[PDB]
Structure 1
């Protein structure tokens, strides 16, 4: 059914049990929360932050489960959304490689489940929409996986403004260079290669898979797609939320 991915080393926590543990989490103002739907840019965005700095709390929770401490102590929250199609496809190939995960079966089979939101991490729909609703009320930066690919400088530009932090021009690119998909894929300290293949086999699918927006186009039949649109446009009626693909 429905749990959530966590990381002492990647594993499944029952959302509730996990929420009970975090329920009354206390937050120092300097703390920096980073939230994302799974396979929506996390490991990437993280290393972008970790770069900018060198306390970062990584959380795949929906907005309505963030410990109030954070709201109260107006913590800086970076949030990253990624278009659903790509997020779906990335998340699919993931189930198809991570042993921790349930069997994805067919790609048509997975879809039905994904749109129903009946997959590890809740509904991507409910997830992204909550956060967007929150960007109105909180110290949240809302970023889009695609816009980063589009303009890494133009994006990190923003992050800095948000953090009051101010880097070099060389130190700047030093970051951009590393947080390119090419460099990061060949990087054992992020690429999750240095892992049990019983846990994650890259010979099936590598965590750092393709990392191109628009890749979904390589898997979604013109039918499955025109299906995805109709179902999407429904769940997103009213939303001011908008994606490049």
Structure 2
């Protein structure tokens, strides 16, 4: 894969803000390549050319829950069975895409050597103006207040949810059935609290602490 110096790359672990951020980057730019690869598997061409990369990470509890429901509604994805069973496989990194942990850490470290803007799903929810302003400084692109507010409006969850071009409702019920769980489900940090039992959560915090020791921190609420 021969990369071009101007190509802009969107990199996420699944269920972390791909669709959302693709839309932000889409509008700002008016070549955008997206990938779910872990840093160690990016083609070397992309580093040598010094492509700008936007990475989006999401707190792993919401990511896990989002990934569960998505499994429920996608035909091409394995049966998740239970949130309990799913948790075990998510924490093990025995899910499509592999380990969230390795993903987010590897990209976190990669930003010491490489032109990467590393953003947080939760920071984008809390203050899209602030996050989108970093993107603009990163792309050395300059945009009117009028258009910046337009982007914030256009890429808000409520608006994207009604947008056929982005909500994945232009796919047959038999590949994604939205009656089970919409692809645009809740879009809310802290939603995981409605699904983790207190005991599931204490178990998580004990595995997470071990598996992270990463100056990477997350918000699990806003």
Instruction: Indicate whether the TM-score tops 0.5.
Output: yes
| Inter-partner Cα distance in structure 2 for 1:172 and 1:107 | 39
Partner of 1:115: 91
Q: How far, CA to CA, are the matches of 1:151 and 1:100 in structure 2?
A: 34
**Aligned match of 2:52 in 76, 83, 87?**
76
d(CA) in 2 for partners of 1:123, 1:98:
20
Deviation for aligned residue 1:80: 0.2
Displacement after TM superposition at 1:54 (Å): 1.8
What are the Cα deviations for residues 61-103 of structure 1, in whole angstroms up to 9, with x where unaligned? Answer: 0000000111000000000000000000000000000001000
CA distance in 2 between partners of 1:129 and 1:165 (Å): 28
Match of 1:220 in 2: 196
What is the aligned counterpart of 1:189 among 165, 169, 190?
Answer: 165
Aligned partner of residue 56 in structure 2, secondary structure: strand
Q: Deviations over 1:130-179 (max 9, x none)?
A: 00000101000000000000100000000000000001111111100011
**Shift of the alpha carbon at 1:43?**
0.3
Q: CA deviation at 1:194?
A: 1.0
How far did residue 230 of structure 1 move? 0.2
Structure 2: how far apart are the matches of 1:197 and 1:137?
A: 44
Instruction: Give the length in aligned residue pairs.
Output: 220
Instruction: Tell me the distance in 2 between the aligned counterparts of 1:205 and 1:51.
Output: 27
Q: Secondary structure at 2:55's aligned position in 1?
A: strand
- 1:194-219 deviations in Å (ceiling 9; x for gaps): 11111000000001000000000000
RMSD: 0.4
Distance in 2 of aligned mates of 1:35 and 1:217: 27
Distance in 1 between residues matched to 2:147 and 2:102, nearest whole Å? 37
d(CA) in 2 for partners of 1:106, 1:152: 34
SS at match of 1:183: helix
Give the C-alpha shift of residue 44 in structure 1: 0.2
**Separation in structure 2 between the aligned mates of residue 86 and residue 74 of structure 1, nearest angstrom:** 32
SS of equivalent to 2:73:
coil
CA distance in 1, matches of 2:97, 2:16: 12
After superposition, the C-alpha distances for 1:36-70 in whole angstroms (9 at most, x for unaligned) are 00000000000000010120010000000000111
Aligned to 2:219: 244
TM-score relative to the length of structure 2:
0.98
SS in 2 for 1:149: helix
4+ residue stretches of structure 1 with deviation over 6 A?
none
Distance in 1, matches of 2:33 and 2:82, equals 35
Secondary structure at the counterpart of residue 142 of structure 1: strand
Partners of 2:82 and 2:153 in 1: CA distance:
37
TM-score, normalised via structure 1 length: 0.89
Q: Deviations over 1:6-45 (max 9, x none)?
A: xxxxxxxxxxxxxxxxxxx111101001100000000000
Q: For structure 2, which runs of at least 5 residues remain unmatched after alignment?
A: none
Of 128, 136, 156 in structure 2, the residue corresponding to residue 180 of structure 1 is 156
SS in 2 for 1:96: helix
Cα distance in 2 between the residues matched to 1:179 and 1:112: 33
